[PDB]
Design a protein around this ligand. Structure first.
Ligand SMILES: Nc1ncnc2c1ncn2[C@@H]1O[C@H](COP(=O)(O)OP(=O)(O)OP(=O)(O)O)[C@@H](O)[C@H]1O
Ligand SMILES: [Mg+2]
Lengths: 176, 70, 140, 290, 30, 32, 441, 76
């Protein structure tokens, strides 16, 4: 945000848009009767037109408290988001334990039953590793250091090929 | 490894591998390295010598072995 | 043509960064894995260590070849000739000394581990690529 | 403490540990300490070198504070990600990426008067897809006069090469007339205003496509790393990672007294605070001082 | 969770090397 | 031990910044 | 029954649930500004966390949210800059009174979105009569602070500010937008300057017109100055600095206006000296010098070092087309003072680089006994963006601080210096400019 | 001799250069000179004596600087 801000009590929101919280402002020429109602609680104060202008004087400047970093947490959130797409297809696995009875054991070929008991031991291998979510935070650290070295470019952190080709067209198609 | 070399040379120089056909001494010692105790190699590697507490204890453990033909 | 002197007697990169790498006759790597990191250039023609810098060769180098370690055993600090005709197994005695050191280096403390160097002079490049394939597969 | 050229580089920086080194320096300068006279020394090659290692101390914590827009839909997470790296360039002393890579061209080719050498030591900075599509036009125009095309501009042997390289620049998609008419300029401020609004329409579609190509490679790397990891049994995973975690601790523990190693193990202690502060109240999160 | 620290620069300006689609949605559907 | 700060919790943790500082403190005094 | 902290807990439980929509996160933000909740930062953090998560966004809830972010003074760049995705998709769906709040909030936060401001200025010039004068200033504040030097809008806004006279807060936003664009149009600044003796109600718009006049270097207003001297308790210490800096640069010397402004910033720096930016501590030392109104003994000595700090930091991070200009002007200063050969000019410009008294480094600092001159190159970033192209007010800021250090600053601007064809013409341009300031040389 | 420079010399660039160059002849020898130009050099000069050359040009001082700091960051 800048140093001086020019908004407050002019072209303001007059009312809430939801029903979860009920806002009612009553603007006079000088001050305003706001009435807020959220849940069981209610509040109603008087906000001057020069009381909202002092609000943006000292800025809040929110910042994220991350376990490791904001970069790492965004890679780990993507690996958690990718593990969800693989967990959703282990959700659609047929219930093999409905065929564990001995009327399926003895009607079945002895080699097609050992394949069935191996395909059930395989699902527990796949499912116990897709729910190993404490391993996603160390897979995110295999993505970070190679990315962070591409950002330590000697040209610019935000440089890429399309810009650097577009600035070769300016460099080459001008005089020497 | 050097401990399985000297055990196999012990099995040939202490007369444990005559009564064995000369064509399959190659396959006879493959039993001898694998059928004696895997703990008797560790003592010979740690000592570096076949001690008096081991040269009988291994040559009496080179009798509880199954050799081809015999 | 203009030939410039470099001021330096012939040198090669020495150090632990040469381990695992396939270099040429002047130490430049030919395995295609970039420059030799963690390395230092030293002369190739050094005066050999004299009488007062030696001590007696007492500890064994195990070849792993039992015709060798029983009959013609090799101490550490001893030059041993492998002489024979062609295709009699001279490399196989030498390769088995290198492969066996890998098996022994996993069991000994850090002070007594043997780091092999194989110099392949005048051989085929296919023969050398078969040896670094064997040494990668064995772990040597 | 900081060496007073770092703290001049951390004034416009906005990460945490650089600003707390600034704020404890400005608190020393409130208690009457003398601001040390900065050096009018360190000639041009040394000044370019320590600027490179001071910008990389503003860029390196700043890159770790920029959330990648992985798996997002739309252009505004990619335009946010690009704009955070623009501001990280400006905070670290870089100019615009157009002005930074063009300075890289004219510095690398200050000795060249032929085009085949200009297209050869600006090889690291342009696409090989674009370096080849200019070397095809160059070796046809040098197969037309049978003399090397000069980097002169007033030579007509360059003029019909530059008229064909302009046809290559549209064949990539680059508006070659728009880019040229921005970095040249115009007299009136109204006719140069309409060419800046269509350069910046190219430029924003240019740097979005470099950020979005960077996101699509992190997305593809992470999906490749995960699918290699989802094919492992769990006992392999926990000991592959505990081996990699413990090997990386002792690389920081055997490092005697180095500043990066104390800061490494201070951050392992701060991760374990984060895991412990969340265990005390998980619906709240970590405890901050309020 | 921790990474190897690296202090090196990128001198090229290249494309970022998009890796290939791993076959695991098509192996787990098999 | 609890409730550290905010400005201490905003630090990115395993950034380099101190390898970059270390190789700047042994290069610039060595190339001068 | 009037429960303000018990309604914060009822807002906290509205945004801490799982599927908060856009309207519930708009109105949670709107209710936090009307309640003035700067003290609770985590509750503002839970609202902007759900403001990025919220996917649907109609025209009314986006502008209620962006109003609340802007008015509340809460900044988080990642959240606000990704709200420019709803905005460029709702932009034909936006009211003209709503498009002014979007572009003011996204522009005032620094969102680098060229597709937004191109389409949002092309709308506001396609329907120029459809926008009231407060809305054309809000868009002008946004496109200027979003990094777009759109002078097509600054002309179309200038025709509106000439046809109708505007509110005081409307004009001071328009002055602040033209100050960052660096325009200094006499035709439109004076049309906005008459709005400031009808009575202004805020001190933030008296201080921002103060800053915008001094940055364009016009002059003080004598009712902006006298609104600022009464209501300098409404201003934050980073805002009173930019008022006193902007009054000093315009040539005001009303010392009672400066006692009011320095009565804010002095106990703030004494309470926490690291509270302000070092760019703002340097803007205090310019203001504590040109008007001459002094400061406390621990403050004015402290902001004197922070002019030395903030001047090297802009010299270390020099634009490298400014580094070309300084080494070009210093070479012409070698030829003007007598050096016809290259080993002479190479060893002369290494003698022009003496250190300033505050610890700084001056680039072309010539010393002849007691009289010292200083040559100042003013590239293009410190020029106005208009066709006369006089330098901005910040170069007279840097001049008067060095002039109060024993120098005689000769200004060499690159619009005049680089229209010259050879080095001999550029030598007598520098030699005339040095002798115009101290003719002892 | 042969001196190769970047652009043609001054009359003071001539006089400062012999003071460099008669410290490359190891007795009471006199150098004549022969002046050539090459903008592949970025200033400085190359003195060629037909049996030795000495390159105090800054175009090689760049490369001798770069390879010193490309060797030293790999040693840290
Ligand atoms: N101990 C062994 N047991 C079985 N086969 C062996 C043995 N040693 C070598 N051979 C085989 O004999 C062949 C010759 O071996 P090797 O290549 O080691 O000989 P060489 O002395 O290196 O010959 P050259 O270098 O002249 O080609 C190889 O193909 C190898 O497979
Ligand atoms: Mg052989």
């Amino acid at each position: 945000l800048t140093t001086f801000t020019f908004s407050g009590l002019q072209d303001a929101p007059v009312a809430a848009l939801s029903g979860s919280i009920k806002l009612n402002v009553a603007a006079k020429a000088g001050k305003a009767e706001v009435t807020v109602a959220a849940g069981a609680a209610k509040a109603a104060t008087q906000v001057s037109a020069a009381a909202l202008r002092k609000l943006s004087g000292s800025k809040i400047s929110l910042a994220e408290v991350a376990r490791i970093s904001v970069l790492h947490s965004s890679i780990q959130n993507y690996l958690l988001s990718l593990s969800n797409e693989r967990y959703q297809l282990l959700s659609q696995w047929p219930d093999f334990t409905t065929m564990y009875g001995k009327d399926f054991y003895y009607r079945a070929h002895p080699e097609d039953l050992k394949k069935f008991y191996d395909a059930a031991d395989e699902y527990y291998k796949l499912y116990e590793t897709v729910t190993e979510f404490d391993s996603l935070s160390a897979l995110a650290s295999q993505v970070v250091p190679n990315y962070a070295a591409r950002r330590r470019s000697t040209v610019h952190p935000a440089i890429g090929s399309t810009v650097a080709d577009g600035a070769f067209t300016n460099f080459l198609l001008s005089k020497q | 490894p050097i401990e399985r070399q000297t055990v196999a040379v012990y099995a040939a120089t202490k007369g444990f591998l005559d009564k064995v056909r000369v064509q399959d001494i190659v396959a006879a010692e493959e039993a001898v390295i694998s059928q004696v105790n895997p703990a008797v190699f560790k003592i010979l590697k740690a000592n570096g010598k076949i001690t008096p507490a081991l040269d009988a204890h291994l040559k009496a453990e080179l009798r509880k072995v199954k050799l081809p033909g015999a | 043509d203009l030939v410039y002197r470099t001021g330096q007697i012939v040198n090669v990169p020495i150090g632990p960064g040469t381990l695992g790498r396939v270099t040429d006759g002047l130490g430049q790597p030919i395995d295609g894995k970039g420059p030799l990191t963690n390395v230092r250039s030293s002369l190739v023609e050094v005066k050999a260590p004299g009488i007062i810098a030696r001590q007696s060769v007492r500890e064994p180098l195990f070849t792993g070849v039992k015709a060798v370690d029983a009959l013609v055993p090799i101490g550490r600090g001893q030059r041993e000739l492998i002489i024979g005709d062609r295709q009699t197994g001279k490399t196989a005695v030498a390769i088995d000394a290198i492969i066996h050191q890998k098996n022994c280096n996993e069991q000994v403390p850090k002070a007594q581990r043997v780091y092999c160097v194989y110099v392949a002079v005048g051989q085929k490049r296919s023969t050398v690529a078969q040896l670094v394939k064997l040494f990668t597969q064995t772990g040597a | 403490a900081v060496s007073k050229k770092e703290v001049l580089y951390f004034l416009s920086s906005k990460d945490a540990e650089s600003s707390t080194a600034v704020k404890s320096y400005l608190k020393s300068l409130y208690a009457g300490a003398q601001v040390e006279a900065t050096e009018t020394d360190a000639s041009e090659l040394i000044a370019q070198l320590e600027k490179k290692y001071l910008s990389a101390q503003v860029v390196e914590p700043g890159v770790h504070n920029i959330a990648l827009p992985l798996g997002e839909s739309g252009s505004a997470p990619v335009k946010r990600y690009a704009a955070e790296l623009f501001n990280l360039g400006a905070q670290a002393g870089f100019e615009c990426p157009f002005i930074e890579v063009s300075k890289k061209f004219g510095q690398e080719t200050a000795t060249s008067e032929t085009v085949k050498d200009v297209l050869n030591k600006t090889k690291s900075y342009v696409s090989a897809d674009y370096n080849a599509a200019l070397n095809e036009v160059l070796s046809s125009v040098e197969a037309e006069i049978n003399g090397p095309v000069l980097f002169d501009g007033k030579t007509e042997g360059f003029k019909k090469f530059a008229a064909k390289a302009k046809a290559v620049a549209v064949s990539r998609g680059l508006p070659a007339d728009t880019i040229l008419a921005y970095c040249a300029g115009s007299a009136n401020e109204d006719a140069a205003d309409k060419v800046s609004k269509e350069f910046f329409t190219w430029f924003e579609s240019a740097y979005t496509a470099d950020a979005a190509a960077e996101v699509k490679a992190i997305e593809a790397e992470a999906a490749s790393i995960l699918d290699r990891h989802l094919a492992k049994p769990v006992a392999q995973i926990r000991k592959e990672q505990a081996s990699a975690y413990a090997s990386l601790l002792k690389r920081a523990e055997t490092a005697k007294g180095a500043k990066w190693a104390e800061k490494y193990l201070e951050d392992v202690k701060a991760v374990q605070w984060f895991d412990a502060s969340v265990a005390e109240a998980p619906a709240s999160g970590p405890k901050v001082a309020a | 969770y921790l990474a190897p620290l690296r202090s090196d620069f990128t001198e090229e300006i290249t494309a970022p090397k998009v890796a290939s689609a791993s076959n695991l949605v098509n192996e787990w559907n098999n | 031990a609890d409730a550290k700060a905010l400005d201490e919790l905003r630090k990115p943790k395993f950034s380099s910044k101190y390898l970059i500082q270390h190789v700047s403190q042994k290069l610039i005094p060595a190339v001068k | 029954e009037n429960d303000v902290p018990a309604i914060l807990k009822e807002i906290d439980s509205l945004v801490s649930r799982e599927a908060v929509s856009a309207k519930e996160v708009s109105d949670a933000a709107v209710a936090l500004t009307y309640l003035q909740v700067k003290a609770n930062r985590r509750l503002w953090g839970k609202v902007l966390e759900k403001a990025g998560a919220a996917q649907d966004y109609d025209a009314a809830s986006l502008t209620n949210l962006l109003w609340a972010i802007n008015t509340g003074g809460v900044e988080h760049f990642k959240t606000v800059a990704e709200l420019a995705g709803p905005a460029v998709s709702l932009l034909p769906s936006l009211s003209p009174v709503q498009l002014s709040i979007v572009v003011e909030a996204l522009g005032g936060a620094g969102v680098k979105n060229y597709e937004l401001y191109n389409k949002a200025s092309a709308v506001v010039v396609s329907k120029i009569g459809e926008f009231k004068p407060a809305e054309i200033a809000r868009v002008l504040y946004g496109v200027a602070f979003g990094g777009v030097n759109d002078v097509a809008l600054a002309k179309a806004a200038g025709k509106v500010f000439a046809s109708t006279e505007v509110d005081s807060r409307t004009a001071a936003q328009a002055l602040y937008a033209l100050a960052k664009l660096g325009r200094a149009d006499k035709a439109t600044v004076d049309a906005l300057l008459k709005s400031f003796k009808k009575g202004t109600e805020s001190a933030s718009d008296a201080a921002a017109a103060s800053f915008a006049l001094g940055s364009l270097s016009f002059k003080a207003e004598k009712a902006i100055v006298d609104a600022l001297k009464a209501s300098a308790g409404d201003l934050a210490p980073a805002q009173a600095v930019e008022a006193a800096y902007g009054l000093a640069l315009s040539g005001a010397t009303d010392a009672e206006a400066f006692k009011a402004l320095f009565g804010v910033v002095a106990p703030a720096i004494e309470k926490a000296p690291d509270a302000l930016e070092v760019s703002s501590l340097a803007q205090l030392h310019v203001a504590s010098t040109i008007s001459g109104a002094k400061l406390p003994a621990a403050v004015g000595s402290f902001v004197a070092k922070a002019f030395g700090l903030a001047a090297d930091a802009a010299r270390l991070k020099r634009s490298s087309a400014e580094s070309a200009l300084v080494a070009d002007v210093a070479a012409a200063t070698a030829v003007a003072f007598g050096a016809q050969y290259r080993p002479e000019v190479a060893s002369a410009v290494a003698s022009y680089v003496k250190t300033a008294p505050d610890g700084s480094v001056l680039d072309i600092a010539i010393t002849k006994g007691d009289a010292k001159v200083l040559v100042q190159a003013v590239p293009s970033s410190l020029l106005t963006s208009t066709t006369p192209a006089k330098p901005l007010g910040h170069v007279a800021a840097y001049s008067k601080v060095r002039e109060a250090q024993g120098y005689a600053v000769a200004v060499v601007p690159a619009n005049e210096f680089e229209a010259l064809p050879d080095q001999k013409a550029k030598a007598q341009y520098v030699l005339a400019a040095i002798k115009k300031v101290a003719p002892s040389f | 001799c042969t001196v190769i420079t970047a652009e043609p010399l001054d009359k003071l660039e001539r006089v400062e250069l012999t003071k460099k160059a008669e410290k490359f002849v190891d007795a009471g020898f006199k150098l004549v000179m022969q002046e050539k130009i090459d903008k592949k050099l970025l200033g400085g000069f190359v003195i060629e004596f037909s049996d030795r050359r000495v390159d105090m040009s800054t175009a090689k001082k760049v490369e001798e600087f770069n390879n010193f700091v490309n060797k030293l960051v790999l040693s840290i």
